[PDB]
Amino acid sequence: STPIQQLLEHFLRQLQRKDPHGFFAFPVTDAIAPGYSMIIKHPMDFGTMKDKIVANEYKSVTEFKADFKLMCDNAMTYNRPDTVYYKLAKKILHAGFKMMSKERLLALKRSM
Known about the structure:
By secondary structure, the protein is mainly α. It is built from six helices and no strands.
């Protein structure tokens, strides 16, 4: 269980806590979101991100953040602004990028 794996697990646990209803837990289906797959070309979700951590597919924080951004951007593309999914995507995006900022990562660097 590599250091990066342990770190991303931690970030992921913190992010999933801001989604109590599990809207980002698993892939959005066409059954619950009509036409979704005709609009979103690269679906992403916490579940898929988890699997990639376990399989050791992320080489950096950068690559993990990219998948996280893809997830929020997908929500803000398919959904209209005045929806719960759009608003939660924005909120979580901002809190994710604050948690995983260059400046916080640097402070951590300096104390190791």
